[PDB]
Each structure stands twice: as structure tokens, then as C-alpha cells.
Coordinates of C-alpha atoms in Angstrom, one line a residue:
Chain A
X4 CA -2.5 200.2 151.1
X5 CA -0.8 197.8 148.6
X6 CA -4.0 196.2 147.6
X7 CA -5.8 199.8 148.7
X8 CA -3.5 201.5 145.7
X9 CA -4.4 198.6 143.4
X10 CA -8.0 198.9 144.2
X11 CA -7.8 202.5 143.6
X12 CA -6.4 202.0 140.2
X13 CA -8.9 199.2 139.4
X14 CA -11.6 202.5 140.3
X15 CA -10.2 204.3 138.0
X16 CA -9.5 201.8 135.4
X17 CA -13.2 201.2 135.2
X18 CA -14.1 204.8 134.7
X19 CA -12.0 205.1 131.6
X20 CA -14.2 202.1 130.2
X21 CA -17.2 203.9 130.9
X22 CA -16.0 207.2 129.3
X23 CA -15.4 204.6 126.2
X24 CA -19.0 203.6 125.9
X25 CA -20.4 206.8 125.7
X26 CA -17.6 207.9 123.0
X27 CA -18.5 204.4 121.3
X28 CA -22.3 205.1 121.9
X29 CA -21.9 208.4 120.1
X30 CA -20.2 207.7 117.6
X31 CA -22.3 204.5 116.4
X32 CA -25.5 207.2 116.7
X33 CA -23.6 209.4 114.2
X34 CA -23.0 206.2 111.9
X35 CA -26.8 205.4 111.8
X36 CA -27.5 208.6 111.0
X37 CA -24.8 208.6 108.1
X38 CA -26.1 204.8 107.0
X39 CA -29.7 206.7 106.9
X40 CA -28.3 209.0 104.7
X41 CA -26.6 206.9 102.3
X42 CA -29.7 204.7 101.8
X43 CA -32.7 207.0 101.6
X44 CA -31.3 209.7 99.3
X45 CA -30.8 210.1 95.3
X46 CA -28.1 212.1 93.8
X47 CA -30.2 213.4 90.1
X48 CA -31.3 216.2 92.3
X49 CA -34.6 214.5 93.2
X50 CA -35.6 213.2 96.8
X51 CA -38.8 211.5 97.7
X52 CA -39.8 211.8 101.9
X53 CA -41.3 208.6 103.5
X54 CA -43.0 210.1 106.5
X55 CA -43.7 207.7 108.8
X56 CA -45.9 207.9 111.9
X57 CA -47.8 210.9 111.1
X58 CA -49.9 211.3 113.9
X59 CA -47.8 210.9 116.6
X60 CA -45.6 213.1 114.4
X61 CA -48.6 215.6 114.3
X62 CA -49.4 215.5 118.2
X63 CA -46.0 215.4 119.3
X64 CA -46.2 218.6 116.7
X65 CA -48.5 220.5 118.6
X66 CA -46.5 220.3 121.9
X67 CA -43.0 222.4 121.8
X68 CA -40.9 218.8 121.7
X69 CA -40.0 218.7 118.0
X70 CA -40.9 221.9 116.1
X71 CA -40.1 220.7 112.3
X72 CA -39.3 217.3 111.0
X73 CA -36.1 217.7 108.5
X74 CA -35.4 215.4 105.8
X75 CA -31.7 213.5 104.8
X76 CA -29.3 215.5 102.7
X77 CA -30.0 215.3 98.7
X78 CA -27.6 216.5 96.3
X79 CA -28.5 218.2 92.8
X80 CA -26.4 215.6 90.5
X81 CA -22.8 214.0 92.6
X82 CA -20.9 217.2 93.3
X83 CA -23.9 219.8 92.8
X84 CA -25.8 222.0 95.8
X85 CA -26.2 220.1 98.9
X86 CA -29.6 220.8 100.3
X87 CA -32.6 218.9 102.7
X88 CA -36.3 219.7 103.1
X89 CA -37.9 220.9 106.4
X90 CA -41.9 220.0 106.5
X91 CA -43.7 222.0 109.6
X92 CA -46.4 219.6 110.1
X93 CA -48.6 222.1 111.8
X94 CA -47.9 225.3 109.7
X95 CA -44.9 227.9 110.3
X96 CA -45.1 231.9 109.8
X97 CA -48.0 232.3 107.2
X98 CA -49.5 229.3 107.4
X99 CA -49.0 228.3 111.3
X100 CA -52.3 226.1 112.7
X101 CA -54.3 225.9 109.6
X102 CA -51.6 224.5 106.6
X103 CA -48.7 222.0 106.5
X104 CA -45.5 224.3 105.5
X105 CA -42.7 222.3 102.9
X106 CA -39.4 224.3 102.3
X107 CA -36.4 223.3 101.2
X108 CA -33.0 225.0 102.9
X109 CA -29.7 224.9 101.0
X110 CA -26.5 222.8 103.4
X111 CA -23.0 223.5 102.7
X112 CA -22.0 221.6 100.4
X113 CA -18.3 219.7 100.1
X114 CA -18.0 221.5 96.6
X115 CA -19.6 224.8 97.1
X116 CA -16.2 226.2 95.9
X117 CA -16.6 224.7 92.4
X118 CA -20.1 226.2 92.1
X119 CA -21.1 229.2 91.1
X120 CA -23.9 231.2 93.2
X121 CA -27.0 232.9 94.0
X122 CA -27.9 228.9 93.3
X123 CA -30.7 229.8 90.4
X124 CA -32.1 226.0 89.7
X125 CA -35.6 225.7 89.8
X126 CA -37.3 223.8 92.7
X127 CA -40.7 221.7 92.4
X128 CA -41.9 220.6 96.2
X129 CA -45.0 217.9 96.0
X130 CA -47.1 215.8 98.3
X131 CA -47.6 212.2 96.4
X132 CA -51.2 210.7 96.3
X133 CA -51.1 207.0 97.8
X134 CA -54.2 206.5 95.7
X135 CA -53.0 206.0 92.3
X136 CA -55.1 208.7 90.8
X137 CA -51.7 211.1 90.1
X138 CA -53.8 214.4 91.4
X139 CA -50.5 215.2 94.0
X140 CA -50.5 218.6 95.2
X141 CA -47.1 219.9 93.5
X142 CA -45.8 223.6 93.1
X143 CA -42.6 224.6 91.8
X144 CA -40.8 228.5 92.0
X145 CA -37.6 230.1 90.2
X146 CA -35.3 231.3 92.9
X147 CA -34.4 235.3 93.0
X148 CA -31.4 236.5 93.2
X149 CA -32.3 239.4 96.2
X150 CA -33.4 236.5 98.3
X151 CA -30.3 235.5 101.0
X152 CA -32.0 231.9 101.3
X153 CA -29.9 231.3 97.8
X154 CA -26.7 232.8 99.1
X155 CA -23.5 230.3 99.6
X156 CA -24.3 228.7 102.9
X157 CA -22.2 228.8 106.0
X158 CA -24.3 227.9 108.7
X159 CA -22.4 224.6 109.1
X160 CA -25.2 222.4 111.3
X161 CA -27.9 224.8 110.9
X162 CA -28.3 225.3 106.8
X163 CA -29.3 228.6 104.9
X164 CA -32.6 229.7 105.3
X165 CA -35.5 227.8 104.8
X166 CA -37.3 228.8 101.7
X167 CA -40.4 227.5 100.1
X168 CA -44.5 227.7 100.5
X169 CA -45.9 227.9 104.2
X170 CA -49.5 227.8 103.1
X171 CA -48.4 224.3 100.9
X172 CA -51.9 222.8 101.3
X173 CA -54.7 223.2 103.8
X174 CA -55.0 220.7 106.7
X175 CA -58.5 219.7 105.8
X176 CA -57.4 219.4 102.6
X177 CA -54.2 217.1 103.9
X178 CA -56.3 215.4 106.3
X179 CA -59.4 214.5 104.3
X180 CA -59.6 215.7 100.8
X181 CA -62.3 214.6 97.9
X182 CA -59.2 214.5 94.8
X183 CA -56.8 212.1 96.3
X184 CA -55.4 210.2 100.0
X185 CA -52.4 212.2 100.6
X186 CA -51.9 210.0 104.1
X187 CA -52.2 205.8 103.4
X188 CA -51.6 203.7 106.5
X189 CA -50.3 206.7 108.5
X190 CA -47.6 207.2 106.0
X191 CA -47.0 210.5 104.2
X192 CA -44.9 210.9 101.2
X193 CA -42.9 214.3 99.8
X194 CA -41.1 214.6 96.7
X195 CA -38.7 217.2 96.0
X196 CA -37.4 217.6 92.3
X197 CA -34.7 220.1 91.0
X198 CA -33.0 220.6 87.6
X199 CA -29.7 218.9 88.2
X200 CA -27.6 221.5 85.5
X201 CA -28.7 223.6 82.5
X202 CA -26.0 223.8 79.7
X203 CA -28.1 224.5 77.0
X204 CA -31.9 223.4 78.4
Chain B
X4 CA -9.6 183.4 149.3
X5 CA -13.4 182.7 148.8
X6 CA -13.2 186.5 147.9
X7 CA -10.0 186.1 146.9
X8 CA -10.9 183.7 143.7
X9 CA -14.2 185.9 143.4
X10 CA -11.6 188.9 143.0
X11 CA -9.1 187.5 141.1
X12 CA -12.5 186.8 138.6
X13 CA -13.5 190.5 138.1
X14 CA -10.0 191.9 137.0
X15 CA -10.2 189.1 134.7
X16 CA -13.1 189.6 133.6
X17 CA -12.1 193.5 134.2
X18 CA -9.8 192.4 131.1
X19 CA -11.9 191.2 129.2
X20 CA -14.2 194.2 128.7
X21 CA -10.7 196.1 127.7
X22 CA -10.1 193.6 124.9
X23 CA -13.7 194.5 123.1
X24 CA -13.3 198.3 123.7
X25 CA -10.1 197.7 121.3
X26 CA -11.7 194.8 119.4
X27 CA -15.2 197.6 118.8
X28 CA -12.9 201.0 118.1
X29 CA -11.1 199.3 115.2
X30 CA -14.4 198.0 113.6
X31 CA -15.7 201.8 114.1
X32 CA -13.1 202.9 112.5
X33 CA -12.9 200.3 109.6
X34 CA -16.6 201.3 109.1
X35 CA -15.6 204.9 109.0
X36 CA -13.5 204.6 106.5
X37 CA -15.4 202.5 104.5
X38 CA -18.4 205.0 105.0
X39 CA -16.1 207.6 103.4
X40 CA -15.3 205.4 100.4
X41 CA -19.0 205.4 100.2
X42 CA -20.4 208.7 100.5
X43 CA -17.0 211.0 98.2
X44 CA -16.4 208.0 95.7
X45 CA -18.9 207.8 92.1
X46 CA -19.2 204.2 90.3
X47 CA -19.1 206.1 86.8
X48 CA -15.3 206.1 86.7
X49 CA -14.9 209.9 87.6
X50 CA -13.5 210.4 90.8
X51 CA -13.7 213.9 92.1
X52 CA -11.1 214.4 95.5
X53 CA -11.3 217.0 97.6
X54 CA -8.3 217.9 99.6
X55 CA -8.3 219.8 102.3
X56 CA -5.7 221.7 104.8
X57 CA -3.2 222.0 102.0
X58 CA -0.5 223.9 104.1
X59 CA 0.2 221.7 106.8
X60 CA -0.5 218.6 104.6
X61 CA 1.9 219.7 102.5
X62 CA 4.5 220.7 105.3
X63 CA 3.4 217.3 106.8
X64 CA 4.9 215.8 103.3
X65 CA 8.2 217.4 103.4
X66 CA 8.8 215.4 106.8
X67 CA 8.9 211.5 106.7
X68 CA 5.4 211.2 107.9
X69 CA 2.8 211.5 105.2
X70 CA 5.1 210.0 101.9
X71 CA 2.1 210.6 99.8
X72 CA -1.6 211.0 99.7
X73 CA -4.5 208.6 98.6
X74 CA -8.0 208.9 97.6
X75 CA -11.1 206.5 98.2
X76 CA -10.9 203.4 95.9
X77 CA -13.6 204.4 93.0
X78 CA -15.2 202.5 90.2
X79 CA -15.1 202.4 86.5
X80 CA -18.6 201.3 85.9
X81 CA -20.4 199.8 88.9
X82 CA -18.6 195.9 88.3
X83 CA -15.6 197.1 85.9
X84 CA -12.3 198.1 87.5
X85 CA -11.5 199.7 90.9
X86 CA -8.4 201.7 90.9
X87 CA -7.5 204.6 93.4
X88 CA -5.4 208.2 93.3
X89 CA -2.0 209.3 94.6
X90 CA -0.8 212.9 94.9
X91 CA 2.4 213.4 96.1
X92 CA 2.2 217.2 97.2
X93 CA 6.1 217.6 97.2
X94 CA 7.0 215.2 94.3
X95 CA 8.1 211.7 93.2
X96 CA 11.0 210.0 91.3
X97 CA 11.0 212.6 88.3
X98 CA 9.2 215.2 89.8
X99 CA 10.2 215.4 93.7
X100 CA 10.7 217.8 95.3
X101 CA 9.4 220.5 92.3
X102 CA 6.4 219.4 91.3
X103 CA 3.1 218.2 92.6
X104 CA 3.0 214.8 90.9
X105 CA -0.8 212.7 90.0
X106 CA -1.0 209.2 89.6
X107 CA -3.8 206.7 89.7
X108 CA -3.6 203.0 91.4
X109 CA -5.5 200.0 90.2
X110 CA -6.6 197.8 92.9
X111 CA -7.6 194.6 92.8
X112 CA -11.6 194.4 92.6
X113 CA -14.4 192.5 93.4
X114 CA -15.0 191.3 89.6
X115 CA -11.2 190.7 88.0
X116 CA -12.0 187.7 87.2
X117 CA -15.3 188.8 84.2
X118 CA -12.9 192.0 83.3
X119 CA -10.1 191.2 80.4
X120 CA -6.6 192.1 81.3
X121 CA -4.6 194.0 80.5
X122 CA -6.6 197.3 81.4
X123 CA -6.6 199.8 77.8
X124 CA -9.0 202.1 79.4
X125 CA -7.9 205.9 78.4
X126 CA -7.1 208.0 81.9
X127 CA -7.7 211.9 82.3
X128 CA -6.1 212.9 85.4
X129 CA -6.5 216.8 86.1
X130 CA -6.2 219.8 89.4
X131 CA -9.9 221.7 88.8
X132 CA -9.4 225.8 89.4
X133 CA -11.5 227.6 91.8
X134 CA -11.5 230.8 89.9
X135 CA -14.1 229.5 87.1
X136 CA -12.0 230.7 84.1
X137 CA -12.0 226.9 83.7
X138 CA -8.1 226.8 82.4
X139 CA -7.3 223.6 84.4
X140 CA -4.1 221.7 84.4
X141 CA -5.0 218.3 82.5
X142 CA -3.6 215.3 81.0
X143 CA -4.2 211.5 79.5
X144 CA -3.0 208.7 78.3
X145 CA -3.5 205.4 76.7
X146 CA -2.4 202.3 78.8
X147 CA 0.9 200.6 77.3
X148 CA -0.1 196.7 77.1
X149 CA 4.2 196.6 78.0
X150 CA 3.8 197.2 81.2
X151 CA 3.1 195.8 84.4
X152 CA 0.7 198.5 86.0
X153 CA -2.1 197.6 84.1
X154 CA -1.8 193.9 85.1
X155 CA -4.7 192.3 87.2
X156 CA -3.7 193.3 90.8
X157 CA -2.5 191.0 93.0
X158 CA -1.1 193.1 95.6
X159 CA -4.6 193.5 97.3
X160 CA -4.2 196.2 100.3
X161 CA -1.3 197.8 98.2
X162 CA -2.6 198.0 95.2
X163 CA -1.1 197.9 91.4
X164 CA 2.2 199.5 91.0
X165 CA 1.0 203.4 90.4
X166 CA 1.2 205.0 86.9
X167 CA 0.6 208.7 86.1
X168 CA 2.8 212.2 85.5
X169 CA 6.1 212.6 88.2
X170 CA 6.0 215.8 86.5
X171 CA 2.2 217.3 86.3
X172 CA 2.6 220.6 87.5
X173 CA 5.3 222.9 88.7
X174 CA 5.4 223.8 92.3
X175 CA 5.4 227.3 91.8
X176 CA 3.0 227.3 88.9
X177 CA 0.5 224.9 91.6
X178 CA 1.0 227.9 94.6
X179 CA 0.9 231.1 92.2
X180 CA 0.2 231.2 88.7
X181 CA -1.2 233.9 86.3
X182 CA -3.6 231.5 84.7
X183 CA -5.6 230.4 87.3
X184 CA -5.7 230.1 90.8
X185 CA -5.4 225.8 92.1
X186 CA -5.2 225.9 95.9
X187 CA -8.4 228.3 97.1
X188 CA -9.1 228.9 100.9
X189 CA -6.3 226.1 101.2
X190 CA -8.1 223.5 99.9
X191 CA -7.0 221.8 96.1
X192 CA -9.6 219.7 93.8
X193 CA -8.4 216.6 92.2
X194 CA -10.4 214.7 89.0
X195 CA -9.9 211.4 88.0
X196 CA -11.7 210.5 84.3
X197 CA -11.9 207.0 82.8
X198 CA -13.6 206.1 79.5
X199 CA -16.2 203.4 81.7
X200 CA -17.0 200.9 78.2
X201 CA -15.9 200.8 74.7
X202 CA -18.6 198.7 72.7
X203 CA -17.9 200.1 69.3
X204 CA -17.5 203.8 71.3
Chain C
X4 CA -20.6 196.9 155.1
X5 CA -19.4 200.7 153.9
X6 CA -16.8 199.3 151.6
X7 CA -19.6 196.4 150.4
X8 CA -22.0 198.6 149.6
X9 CA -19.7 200.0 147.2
X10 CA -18.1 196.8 146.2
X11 CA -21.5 195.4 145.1
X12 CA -22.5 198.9 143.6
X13 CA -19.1 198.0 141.8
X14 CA -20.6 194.7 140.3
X15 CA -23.3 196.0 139.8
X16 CA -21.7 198.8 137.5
X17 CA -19.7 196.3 136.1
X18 CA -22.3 194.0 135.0
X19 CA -24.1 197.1 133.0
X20 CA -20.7 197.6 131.3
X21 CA -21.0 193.7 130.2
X22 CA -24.8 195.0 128.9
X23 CA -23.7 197.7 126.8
X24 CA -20.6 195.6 124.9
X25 CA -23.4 193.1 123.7
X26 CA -25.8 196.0 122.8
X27 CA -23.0 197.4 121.3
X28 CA -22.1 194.1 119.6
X29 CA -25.3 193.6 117.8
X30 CA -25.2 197.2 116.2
X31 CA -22.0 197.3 115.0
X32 CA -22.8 193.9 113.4
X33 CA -26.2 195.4 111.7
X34 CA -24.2 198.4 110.5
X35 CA -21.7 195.9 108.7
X36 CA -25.1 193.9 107.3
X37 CA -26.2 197.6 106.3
X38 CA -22.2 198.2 104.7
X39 CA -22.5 195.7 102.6
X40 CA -25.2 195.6 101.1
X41 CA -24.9 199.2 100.2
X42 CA -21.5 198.2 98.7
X43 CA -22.6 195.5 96.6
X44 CA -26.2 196.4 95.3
X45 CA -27.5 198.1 92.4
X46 CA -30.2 200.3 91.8
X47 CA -31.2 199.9 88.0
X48 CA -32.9 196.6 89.0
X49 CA -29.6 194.7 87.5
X50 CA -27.9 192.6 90.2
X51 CA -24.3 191.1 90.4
X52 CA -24.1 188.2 93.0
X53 CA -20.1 186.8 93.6
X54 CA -20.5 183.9 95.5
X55 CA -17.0 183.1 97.0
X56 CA -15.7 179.8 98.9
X57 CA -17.9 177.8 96.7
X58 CA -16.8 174.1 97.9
X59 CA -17.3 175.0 101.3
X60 CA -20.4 176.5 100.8
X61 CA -21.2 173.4 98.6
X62 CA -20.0 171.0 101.2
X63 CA -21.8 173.1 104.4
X64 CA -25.2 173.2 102.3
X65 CA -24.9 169.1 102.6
X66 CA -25.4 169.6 106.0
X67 CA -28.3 171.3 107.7
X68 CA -26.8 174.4 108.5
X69 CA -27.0 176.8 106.1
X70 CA -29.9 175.7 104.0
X71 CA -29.8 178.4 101.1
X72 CA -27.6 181.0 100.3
X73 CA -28.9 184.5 99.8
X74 CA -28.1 187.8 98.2
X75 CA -28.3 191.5 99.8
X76 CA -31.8 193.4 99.1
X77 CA -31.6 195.2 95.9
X78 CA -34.0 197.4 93.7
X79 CA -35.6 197.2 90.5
X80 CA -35.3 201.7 90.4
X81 CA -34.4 204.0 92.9
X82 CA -38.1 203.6 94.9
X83 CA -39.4 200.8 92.8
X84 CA -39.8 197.4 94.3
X85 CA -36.8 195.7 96.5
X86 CA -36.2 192.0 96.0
X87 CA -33.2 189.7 97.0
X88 CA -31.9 186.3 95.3
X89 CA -32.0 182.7 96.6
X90 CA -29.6 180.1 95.3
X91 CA -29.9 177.2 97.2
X92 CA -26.6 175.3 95.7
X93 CA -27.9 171.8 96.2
X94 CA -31.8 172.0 95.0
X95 CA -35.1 172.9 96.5
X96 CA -38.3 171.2 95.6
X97 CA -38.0 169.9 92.0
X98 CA -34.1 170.0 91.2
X99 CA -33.0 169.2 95.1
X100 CA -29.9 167.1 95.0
X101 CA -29.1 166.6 91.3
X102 CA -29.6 170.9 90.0
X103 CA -28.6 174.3 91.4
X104 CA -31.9 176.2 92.1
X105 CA -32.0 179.8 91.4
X106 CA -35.2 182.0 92.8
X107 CA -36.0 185.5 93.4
X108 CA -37.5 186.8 96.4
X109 CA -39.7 190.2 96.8
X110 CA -39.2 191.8 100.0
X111 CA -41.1 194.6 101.8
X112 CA -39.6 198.1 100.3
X113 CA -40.1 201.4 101.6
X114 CA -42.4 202.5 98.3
X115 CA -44.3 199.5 97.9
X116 CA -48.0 202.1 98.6
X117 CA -46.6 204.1 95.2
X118 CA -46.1 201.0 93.7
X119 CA -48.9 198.6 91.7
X120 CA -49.7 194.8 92.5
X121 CA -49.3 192.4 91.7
X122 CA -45.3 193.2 90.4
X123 CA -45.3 192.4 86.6
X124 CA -42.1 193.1 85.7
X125 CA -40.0 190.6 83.8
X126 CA -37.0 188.9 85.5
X127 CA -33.7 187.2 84.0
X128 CA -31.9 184.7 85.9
X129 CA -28.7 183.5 84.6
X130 CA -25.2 182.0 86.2
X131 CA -22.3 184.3 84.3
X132 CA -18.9 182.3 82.4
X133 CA -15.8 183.2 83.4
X134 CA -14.1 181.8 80.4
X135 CA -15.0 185.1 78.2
X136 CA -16.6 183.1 75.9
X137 CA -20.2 184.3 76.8
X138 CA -21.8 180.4 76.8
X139 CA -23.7 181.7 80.5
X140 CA -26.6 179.9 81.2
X141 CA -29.6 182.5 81.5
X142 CA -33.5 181.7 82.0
X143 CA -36.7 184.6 82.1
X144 CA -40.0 184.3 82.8
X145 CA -43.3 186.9 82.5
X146 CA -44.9 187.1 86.5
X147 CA -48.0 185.6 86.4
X148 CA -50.8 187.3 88.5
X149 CA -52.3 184.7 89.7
X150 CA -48.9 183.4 92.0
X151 CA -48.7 184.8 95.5
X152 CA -45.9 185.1 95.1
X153 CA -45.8 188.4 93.1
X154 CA -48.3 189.9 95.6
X155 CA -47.5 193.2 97.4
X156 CA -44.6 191.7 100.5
X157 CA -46.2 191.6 104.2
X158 CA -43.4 189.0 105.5
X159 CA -40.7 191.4 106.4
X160 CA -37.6 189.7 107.5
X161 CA -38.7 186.6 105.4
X162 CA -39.4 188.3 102.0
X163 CA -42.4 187.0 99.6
X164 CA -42.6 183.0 98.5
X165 CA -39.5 182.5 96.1
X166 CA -40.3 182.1 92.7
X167 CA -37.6 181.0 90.2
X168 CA -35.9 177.7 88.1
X169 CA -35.5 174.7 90.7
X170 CA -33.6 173.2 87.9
X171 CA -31.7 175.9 86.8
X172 CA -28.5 173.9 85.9
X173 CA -27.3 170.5 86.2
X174 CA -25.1 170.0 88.9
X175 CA -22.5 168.0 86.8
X176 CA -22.8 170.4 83.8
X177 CA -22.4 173.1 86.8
X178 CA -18.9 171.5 88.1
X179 CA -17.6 170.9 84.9
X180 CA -19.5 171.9 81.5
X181 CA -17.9 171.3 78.0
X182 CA -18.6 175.4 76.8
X183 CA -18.4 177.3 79.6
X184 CA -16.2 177.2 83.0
X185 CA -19.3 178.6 85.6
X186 CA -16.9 178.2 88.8
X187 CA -13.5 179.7 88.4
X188 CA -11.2 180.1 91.5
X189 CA -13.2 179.0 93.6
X190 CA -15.9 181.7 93.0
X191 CA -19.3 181.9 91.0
X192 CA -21.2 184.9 89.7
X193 CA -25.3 185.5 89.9
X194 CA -27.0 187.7 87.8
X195 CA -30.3 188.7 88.0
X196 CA -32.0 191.5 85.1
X197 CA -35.5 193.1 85.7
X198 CA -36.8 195.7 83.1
X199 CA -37.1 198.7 86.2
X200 CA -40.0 200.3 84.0
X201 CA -42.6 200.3 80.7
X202 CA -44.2 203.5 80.6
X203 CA -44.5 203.0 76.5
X204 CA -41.5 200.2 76.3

């Protein structure tokens, strides 16, 4: 039982290195995902989407197994809004099944405080065209004040509501139109542009 | 002792697992903090800081542990001088114990050598107020060539010896004052301004 | 044989513990390649190289290992083209042995489908003074379309040909020059300019 005790301890020992790598594990995944962050996005209040994979991103669509693919936290100049753009890929509400859904949903921000709110910037939500030709599908809207969706946010992880167009464009259109490509080597690109302050205009 | 030498192997190398585990949780958590620096700092020599849990950060400060708090290291210019921020919460020298006191830290940085020395940049160092009224507490100042603060840092993870106001705002004035309000759902703004280049201004 | 079973499903464990460090290992070294160049990079297609531990790096490049230095990705524009710099320290080609070569390399970005080809931006290469004086050497050229070199990047991890100055400086003029210093404190800076875009100039 002296070397029984000692063995024990050793058991145990190596358990608490185990718990370690998974706390490590995690904690590397939640650096990646910051590092992501950091790299892809643009602090003027404009974001452009590289969408990668789009038909296994479509398919995998269709089944349950990711709903929405969610873009990386953009910021409306340094220490403006906080926000990040939810494309449905297969439609959502209105345009479920027939149209590919872009909306933008407002994050908490670190300096929400210094802001002032409804959040009343206007928001212009595009789909690029790989060809060169510049005819992008691109709408824009002024937010109102009844909406909620423009409300300070306080859903932490989740974000305010989404808000945006469901029927953005038609997936015949998306797929195969006669204007422009839209989807270049199975690559998709989406562009999000905001007006960082006002002051005077 | 065939097993015996076979044994006496595993707990070494047992061992030897442990020292990466410590080895891998400091590098996690160097990159942490140097992910903060990254995402809350601006290379435009502004420096908003955020600070949070006021209360107990400031009870923390009466006790021993704590002295004062810093900001992430921030840029004047993207290659021009890095300097950081030190509040003391519950005073310094002149101001300790009364008043919150604000001064910024020059570090050394990653291009000393193309900068001149001694720094002449102006600094604006001000507490932002929640309310929107906009009647902040700020002040400036021109660097003195006399003295030694503004000397190329040598002091590396210390910094430069830190200059600013013992004296920036009263204690009672900081927790309750008519003006404005400073500390709002007990969290305090800090802003750091620095005129970037000079040419012929 | 009950106690070995579980003393080999010990091993066994252990081993996968040993798996997971190196894993582990590998990642946290990316994220630190990832840091860094964060950290150090520019996105107005200006680039600020500091090469540090210059006689050693001098020395090494004599020898096989290490055969070039070169720089952390950086971009000409938030999504324009991403390119890194090559100074090989001894020569390449033309200027090996007797001149410091100084190239560009374009790499495969993330936007290169919104982007034209061939690239036909201008570049600026020069080697910075850390006298004050301003004497720094600095060399541009106008891409020519007919090099591969500026065609769109397929290479990946090895980037595009390099294209550049093989005689940039002479080595002796380099070490010790009559107007300028070039290497001060055992340290050397690397500049590179691009023009990040025309629309009307």
C-alpha cells in the first residue's frame, strides 16, 4: 500500500493533466477565433464577407446542422456600434427556400455607454460581382426608431435582432444570373457599409 | 527492476508533461495579454480606456494590492512613440488619498532609434461623462525639454518615469458631482490625446 | 493481468497526453506567427521592416541556414493585394556576395478575385538612416506586365517570384557609408511604399 498510495496519487496526478488540455484546448479555440477577428475586420464602419465553400455551405444549409452563417464583429469607426452580419444562405421568414436573406444584428458594444441610441446610421448590405463588371446587387435602408432591432443591445452572446432584407436576391438570380457572377471559384463575397458619424454630413 | 527502470521512466516522463502545461499556460496568457493590447489600443495616439468594476477596484487600491492601474501600451502614429496610462483611483504623491490622479508612461518602442528625443508632443489626458452633457474633466500640457520623463526609455518593462496631474480631480467631485456624472453603472472612461506629427501643423 | 490491462490502458492514455502537447505546440507557435505579424504590419501599403541582431544574422546568412531574411505579409489597402519583403543580406543573383539585395514578394491574399492582374502598382524600396540626416538609400520601379512575377499569386506558402534591386547597396557603403549610418545598434530599418490606389491619381 506504500507504492499502492503512490500509484493512486500518480492516477490522480494524471487526471489533473487531462482536465489541463481541455482548459488549454478551449482556450486556444477562443484565441483563433479572436485572431480571426482581429484580421478579417475594418474599423471605418465597412466589412467585406469572404464566403468560402459555398456549396457545402448551401447543402450543409438545407439540413438543420448550421441554420445561418454569421460574420466577425465590425465596428462603425474605433469606439462606435459593434455589430456582425448573419447571411441565411437558403432564405429565412419571407424569403425562406427561394432567396438568400443578408441582415445585419447590432452586438454589445464595449462603449455602448458613450453612445447615444435608437442607433439611427444608415446601413447599405451588397453582394460583390467577381466579374469586374461593378453590377453588385446592393440595397441600403434608414433605421426607424419604433423598430427594437436598434435598441441598446443586451443579449450578450446572442446580439439584438437581426434586421435587414430576407428576399436580398433570388437564388436563380444568385446562382446563375445574366448581369454579373456573384459566386467565382465557390467563393461568395458580402459587403456591408455604414456611415461611421454624421456631425454636420 | 526491469519494470522497475520502465517505472521510474513514466513519472519522469510523468514530469515532463507537467513542465509544458506550465511552460503552454504562460504563453496563453502572454498571448492574451498581448491580444488585449491589440483589439482596446488605436495607433492614432488617442487611447480610449475603459475601466470597469470601479468599486472593488477602487477598494482593491486602498489595500496594498493593486498600487495603481495601467492601460494597454498605445501608439502615437503607427512607428512614432509608444507610451501607456496610469490612474491611481485613490491618489499619488500630491494627490493621494483625495484625488483620482492621471498620468501617461512612455515606454520604450519598437522605432526610438528614427524618433528625435526629447518627446515635445502636446498631451490631453481627460475622464469622458456618461451623461452626454459633454462637460468632461480635461487637461494638457507641453513636454518640459528639463526633464527626464520625456527621455528615450530605457527602462523597458517599466517604462519611462510617469508624468501627468497628482491632482486631476477631486474624490468627491469624481463619485458625485453636480456637473456631470464620471463613474456610470460602475464603470469610468479614460482618454488619452496626443498631437501624432507636427510638419509645419 | 487486471492491473495490466489498466497499466497499459495507462500508457496508452499517457502517450495521447504526449500527442496533444505537440498538437498544442504547433498552434500556439502559429498563433505567435499570427501575433506578430498583426503587430508589426501596415495596411496603407507602407511597410516598416526593423531588422535586429544584424551581425548575427549577417554572419548566419554565410552559412546555409537561413538563406534570406523575410518580412511579415502586409497590404497595399485594407483588401487590396498582400505582399511580403525579401532581403537576402549577402546577395542573390546579380549582387550575391559583394550588395545587399532587396525584393518584394506578392503572396496569395484573401481578395485577389476583386482585384485586377497583372498588379501595376508602383513600389519603393529603400534602407532608412538612422543618423536623422535623411541620406536613406531608396530605389522604385513601374511593374512591368510582361514579368510573372506581377501575375495574380497561386504559390501559397511560397509567395510569387521576387522581384526587386539585387544590387540595392554596396555592402561596404552598407557597413560604413560617408553620409548616412544605415546600421545603428546593431539594427537596420526596411521600407517599402506602394501607391494602395489611382482611381484619377
Amino acid at each position: 500500500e506504500a507504492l499502492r498510495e503512490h500509484l493512486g496519487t500518480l492516477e490522480e496526478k494524471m487526471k489533473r493533466h487531462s482536465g489541463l488540455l481541455d482548459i488549454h484546448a478551449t482556450q486556444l479555440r477562443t484565441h483563433s477565433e479572436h485572431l480571426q477577428e482581429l484580421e478579417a475586420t475594418s474599423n471605418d464602419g465597412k466589412l467585406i464577407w469572404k464566403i468560402e465553400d459555398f456549396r457545402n455551405k448551401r447543402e450543409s444549409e438545407v439540413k438543420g446542422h448550421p441554420p445561418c452563417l454569421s460574420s466577425v464583429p465590425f465596428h462603425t469607426g474605433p469606439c462606435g456600434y459593434k455589430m456582425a452580419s448573419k447571411v441565411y444562405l437558403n432564405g429565412d421568414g419571407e424569403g425562406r427556400g427561394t432567396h438568400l436573406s443578408l441582415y445585419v444584428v447590432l452586438m454589445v458594444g464595449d462603449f455602448d455607454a458613450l453612445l447615444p441610441w435608437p442607433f439611427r446610421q444608415t446601413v447599405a448590405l451588397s453582394v460583390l460581382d467577381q466579374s469586374g463588371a461593378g453590377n453588385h446587387q446592393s440595397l441600403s435602408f434608414k433605421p426607424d426608431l419604433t423598430s427594437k432591432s436598434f435598441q441598446r443591445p443586451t443579449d450578450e452572446k446572442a446580439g439584438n435582432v437581426a434586421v435587414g432584407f430576407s428576399c436580398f436576391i433570388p437564388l436563380i438570380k444568385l446562382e446563375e444570373p445574366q448581369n454579373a457572377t456573384y459566386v467565382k471559384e465557390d467563393t461568395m463575397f458580402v459587403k456591408v457599409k455604414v456611415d461611421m458619424v454624421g456631425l454636420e454630413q
